[PDB]
Design a protein around this ligand. Structure first.
Ligand SMILES: *[C@@H]1O[C@H](CO)[C@@H](O[C@@H]2O[C@H](CO)[C@@H](O[C@H]3O[C@H](CO)[C@@H](O)[C@H](O[C@H]4O[C@H](CO)[C@@H](O)[C@H](O)[C@@H]4O)[C@@H]3O)[C@H](O)[C@H]2NC(C)=O)[C@H](O)[C@H]1NC(C)=O
Ligand SMILES: *[C@@H]1O[C@H](CO)[C@@H](O[C@@H]2O[C@H](CO)[C@@H](O[C@H]3O[C@H](CO)[C@@H](O)[C@H](O[C@H]4O[C@H](CO)[C@@H](O)[C@H](O)[C@@H]4O)[C@@H]3O)[C@H](O)[C@H]2NC(C)=O)[C@H](O)[C@H]1NC(C)=O
Ligand SMILES: *[C@@H]1O[C@H](CO)[C@@H](O[C@@H]2O[C@H](CO)[C@@H](O[C@H]3O[C@H](CO)[C@@H](O)[C@H](O)[C@@H]3O)[C@H](O)[C@H]2NC(C)=O)[C@H](O)[C@H]1NC(C)=O
Ligand SMILES: *[C@@H]1O[C@H](CO)[C@@H](O[C@@H]2O[C@H](CO)[C@@H](O[C@H]3O[C@H](CO)[C@@H](O)[C@H](O)[C@@H]3O)[C@H](O)[C@H]2NC(C)=O)[C@H](O)[C@H]1NC(C)=O
Ligand SMILES: [Cl-]
Ligand SMILES: [Cl-]
Lengths: 426, 23, 426
């Protein structure tokens, strides 16, 4: 007569895209629509029981989260788990829920190994995955003739969820799986100056198509050092893997978009350097339903959660929890319509998998593997104004690259420079 | 280190990627 | 009035050094001696509740084990956990017990990261640690002039506990922490022939002091390929990191010791190749108490466990669980003698740490970090007979290398070859 939904997310820390101050009102919006829909679980009263994935210091934990999962499992015996979003939180919990035969929904956990559903059984991802980034890079390289060698630089803060490692892992593994070109890689520490000589040296020795996963300031500094060192768009192209677009403002206002502007009197040199820089991000959903969702999300989050949800790419994560929760309820409704129960995790999961759905994020497709296809945008600067704008869009499902607003990809030489230099790298 | 010292979960050992591996 | 000891180990699989078929009777012997000792917990009746760390396939699991720990924690509220020994089993359980403020004892879990007692609080290791292997290697390099470069090759079976990775990790980190020499490393897959050209190439390009962690057969094949390629003891030295001495028989009988002998008509070529090979192992405890312990262990394990405990270096693990459990009981006895309780994990743990103890393994020392100092042996072949024997012993506590039975370290050139070649590696 009622559905018990267990939630394991950061219930107090509001810094994550999957924080409860941000996913809570999104999910409450979802349940509120379930009530208004006579075609989704009629008569059922879906309840939620919460558990925090963060430890005493307030960061998501590889211990707090699995402990909270067990706690909710024996106290309430839920039918489904929601979250966690952190990789190190979701890995033990996913293995627990897989062993319990309970479905798991999260718009986080994008890491490669979560994709091994033979292990993370009944885990459905409704947000971005890092192999899907590999899919975008693959399509990019096929469309620009880069079929030999690319360099990947990534950095992480000690003690975090290693976001840039998992991003690069997914890109590296998928791109090599599909193109079998040489993908060199190098980890660095952002705060460590000793690595910047090393990195610049590697940049001009290991690759000319260069992907960097780092903070905005690290990517700006590297560009400034690359210009200072005579590394221009005629030979090098630097892709910043900024999937949440931290180096940009939101797509609602703040016209125009300048990631090289900093106010430190280096902005004139940074713009000239950023002519060789392009920014890869997740795609902002275009559909109006998304904008109405943000309006309601901001209103609810400020109302029953004392939080101020700001505009930006991170909001696709609570939008995807909202869409994933609606995706699940219909699956459960369909399972009940054929004599099943809410505990047939296999039947319910298979109903969600390999399926197209319409949500606030627009068209979303769950692939045969249970992971949402992810759309990406490619930002480039206008050589006239210097501001960055989307010039290329990747549909994750059809794996097609489409030009945006009749824009062209800026190249100092008119065409992309080769991924291999003249007479080798020497 | 680029390869060693990074936690003890099989999720961080799916590719190496800091390591010098032939696999 | 009674002490509850929770156990998370492989209760069915008897393949691990820390299997219950082998640690069970050792622990049984320990509790049996606690009864006989009026000075160890008088009146208390120590009970044991068991949980299996293996999953449905029968291998130790990063999921079964933490689940069993939770299960025992709420069902019985134990005062101490015993095990697990697998690294991926111990890490989540260790973090759980550290969050529960419950002491943890294991003679396994030798991985570097377990050494972070700021995370793995109240975890006391009474068996070997892989940093201690670095200590041995450091002392070795200091005593033979190798202070520049060494190469480390390691391989693992896909899906196991990655033993050779954690071995090498501990050696890598510790040796570099103390000597700051270049330690090159390369992973390979044993069953993959494509790596043997690569490895042989790396051997003669990346180092001359070479450590290999692999199976016996892989190390033999590598030696055979090294001889076939003209790599002799005059320039190269190959250390096999065979800590449990899988490539050797037991030290009780089976005289003599020939790891190159295989019976495949290649034994004549393998002996000549193994002239450049030395084997690093744990040290067999010399004391008579150890021999009497094995006799009783074999008897009990065949009696109440239907298992046949065979002679070999692996038996130091159940001996260390036995010694570790006795070390605990005295600590608890001393805590009770000063008004504490059995739940003062911090007081009990500190009483065990930085402490010398006398057990069946002889002198054992728990360092300031809660880890048992580990003694190592160095085997070398006699150029007359070809059989291998211990020629060097490392006391983990004093960090001294002592010659064994007036033997000398065999060198084709009379002295060890330099860790750097003549005019560079080119
Ligand atoms: C990224 O690529 C995806 C794959 O190419 C796109 O998916 C396609 O999405 C469209 C709709 O957005 C979908 O179209 C049809 O889907 C229904 C199932 O086949 C079909 O019944 C619909 O038809 C009905 O409605 C139309 C009016 O809309 C009527 O004219 C018809 O007579 C009928 O009543 C609808 O036409 C495709 O099937 C779907 N393709 C795949 C392979 O799933 C994504 O939309 C695209 N995303 C973006 C943002 O571009
Ligand atoms: C690896 O190195 C370790 C450090 O060098 C060695 O540890 C040493 O072990 C010995 C005993 O094995 C220990 O000796 C004394 O320990 C007691 C504490 O100091 C001390 O009270 C003892 O003295 C008593 O007994 C003797 C007879 O045995 C009498 O003559 C005395 O009058 C007294 O009544 C005992 O002498 C060292 O203290 C200890 N050193 C350290 C730094 O801990 C390990 O033994 C060694 N292992 C191996 C296998 O070689
Ligand atoms: C909410 O989460 C934030 C990110 O998850 C967190 O920010 C970060 O805080 C940690 C402290 O836990 C910083 O890191 C340190 O971690 C260990 C534990 O002290 C230290 O040993 C390390 O040396 C390191 O100093 C991160 O650097 C920091 N990162 C950022 C971007 O701020 C917030 O603190 C959390 N806030 C609350 C209220 O819980
Ligand atoms: C007792 O433990 C032994 C070692 O922990 C175990 O040996 C190993 O068994 C596994 C099977 O679980 C083999 O590996 C395979 O693992 C996965 C799961 O099927 C596969 O996808 C892999 O491709 C791989 O084939 C190991 O190779 C094997 N190792 C050895 C040295 O034998 C025993 O099977 C366990 N026995 C019992 C009765 O539980
Ligand atoms: Cl989380
Ligand atoms: Cl174990």
């Amino acid at each position: 007569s009622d559905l018990t939904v267990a939630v394991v997310l950061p219930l107090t820390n509001t810094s994550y895209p999957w924080s409860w101050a941000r996913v809570g009102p999104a999910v409450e919006l979802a349940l509120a629509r379930v009530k208004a829909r006579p075609d989704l679980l009629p008569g059922w009263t879906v309840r939620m029981v919460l558990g925090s994935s963060e430890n005493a210091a307030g960061v998501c934990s590889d211990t707090a989260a699995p402990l909270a999962a067990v706690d909710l499992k024996w106290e309430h015996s839920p039918a489904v788990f929601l979250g966690p979003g952190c990789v190190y939180s979701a890995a033990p919990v996913g293995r627990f829920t897989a062993h319990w035969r309970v479905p798991l929904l999260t718009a986080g956990a994008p890491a490669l190994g979560i994709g091994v559903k033979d292990e993370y059984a009944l885990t459905t991802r409704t947000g971005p995955s890092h192999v899907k980034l590999g899919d975008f890079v693959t399509a990019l390289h096929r469309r620009l003739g880069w079929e030999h060698q690319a360099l990947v630089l990534y950095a992480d803060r000690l003690g975090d969820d290693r976001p840039c490692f998992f991003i690069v892992e997914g890109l590296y593994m998928r791109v090599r799986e599909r193109l079998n070109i040489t993908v060199n890689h190098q980890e660095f520490v952002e705060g460590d100056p000793d690595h910047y000589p090393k990195l610049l040296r590697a940049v001009r020795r290991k690759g000319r198509v260069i992907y960097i996963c780092s903070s905005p300031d690290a990517f700006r500094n590297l560009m400034l050092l690359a210009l200072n060192a005579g590394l221009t768009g005629e030979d090098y192209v630097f892709f910043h893997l900024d999937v949440f677009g931290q180096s940009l403002k939101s797509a609602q206002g703040l016209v125009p978009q300048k990631p090289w502007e900093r106010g430190d009197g280096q902005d004139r040199s940074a713009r000239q350097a950023f002519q060789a820089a392009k920014i890869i991000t997740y795609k902002e959903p275009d559909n109006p339903e998304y904008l109405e969702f943000l309006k309601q999300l901001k209103l609810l989050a400020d109302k029953k959660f004392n939080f101020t949800v700001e505009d930006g790419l991170k909001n696709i994560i609570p939008a995807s929890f909202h869409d994933g929760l609606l995706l699940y309820v219909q699956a459960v409704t369909e399972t009940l319509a054929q004599g099943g129960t809410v505990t047939d995790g296999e039947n319910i999961t298979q109903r969600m998998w390999n399926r197209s759905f319409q949500g606030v994020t627009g068209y979303l497709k769950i692939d045969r593997n249970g992971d949402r296809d992810t759309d990406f945008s490619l930002w480039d600067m206008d050589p006239e104004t210097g501001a960055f704008r989307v010039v290329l869009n990747y549909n994750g499902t059809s794996q097609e690259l489409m030009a945006v607003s009749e824009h062209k990809l800026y190249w100092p030489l008119g065409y992309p420079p080769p991924d291999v230099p003249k007479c080798g790298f020497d | 280190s680029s390869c060693f010292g990074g936690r003890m979960d099989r999720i961080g050992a799916q590719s190496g990627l800091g390591c010098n591996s032939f696999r």
